[PDB]
RNA sequence: GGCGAAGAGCCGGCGAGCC
RNA sequence: GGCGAAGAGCCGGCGAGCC
């Protein structure tokens, strides 16, 4: 499996709520192709990788590229929750915040919390 | 009809035979999408348009585009004859010789006779 | 009701392969 | 054999639309 570490549920809820609100005033990429290219292009501020993705090879490359580019990434239980948070009626294996909009502080606190684990 | 002039049957046979041999030492584009783009790009020396194409709007733009680009064009009865001559296993609505290989004079003479119509 | 971020369809490049 | 130059599939691009 591609999941490198365990994320507390309340921090996950914080992450998806943040993603929901960011879609309103920022820019988010949704889907593994858009997310990976956004990371590769140097644009991603925070990427989300679902934990129930099968086969794992859809997203298994995503964590290492994110490590090489020093871009924080977080895990969420279900592709359904991530799909709901980006608001595209279907499950979603990975996503990314590209522009934090007006949610400077909330994003900053969240990313400090990911690096702290 | 999108057929701008009448092409004698014997000129059709000469044209398809020459095209047949040209695939071997020259270069031919096959299908309307490739041919139209190649003429528009200015590389095509001579294009073939089947007369039994349906619906006609598939190839109806080619004659005038070829005129705009000053490219000589000839008509052949059936997309079947053109498809066999360009050597595919399905019908073909239009084609083009872009580089004459070893047939410089033959292509030139053919084009003069086409202008003669 | 169906399909769809496990990528919709559309575009550029190649231009005969896929089951 | 079915589909296929009326564009097969591969690559790049946009990134939610098509039945």
Author numbering:
A (entry chain C), B (entry chain D): 1 to 117
What does the paper say about this structure?
We have solved new crystal structures for two further forms of the two-k-turn unit in which the 3b,3n sequences of the Kt-7 k-turns were changed either to U·U or to GC. Both sequences confer the N3 conformation, but neither is well folded in the presence of metal ions alone. In contrast to the 3b,3n = U·U structure, four two-k-turn units have associated in the lattice to form a square structure with four-fold rotational symmetry. Eight AfL7Ae molecules bind the square assembly each with standard interactions with the k-turns, four on each side. The four two-k-turn units interact sequentially around the square by coaxial end-to-end interactions between C helices as before. Comparison of these two structures reveals the strong influence of the 3b,3n sequence. By alteration of just one basepair, the shape of the assembly changes significantly, and the pore radius almost doubles. In addition, exchange of a single basepair can almost double the pore radius or shape of a molecular assembly.
k-Turns are widespread RNA architectural elements that mediate tertiary interactions. The standard k-turn is formed in duplex RNA where a short bulge is followed by G·A and A·G basepairs, and folds to generate a kink with an included angle of 50° between the axes of the two helical arms. We describe a double-kink-turn motif comprising two inverted k-turns that forms a tight horse-shoe structure that can assemble into a variety of shapes by coaxial association of helical ends. Using X-ray crystallography we show that these assemble with two (dumbell), three (triangle) and four units (square), with or without bound protein, within the crystal lattice.
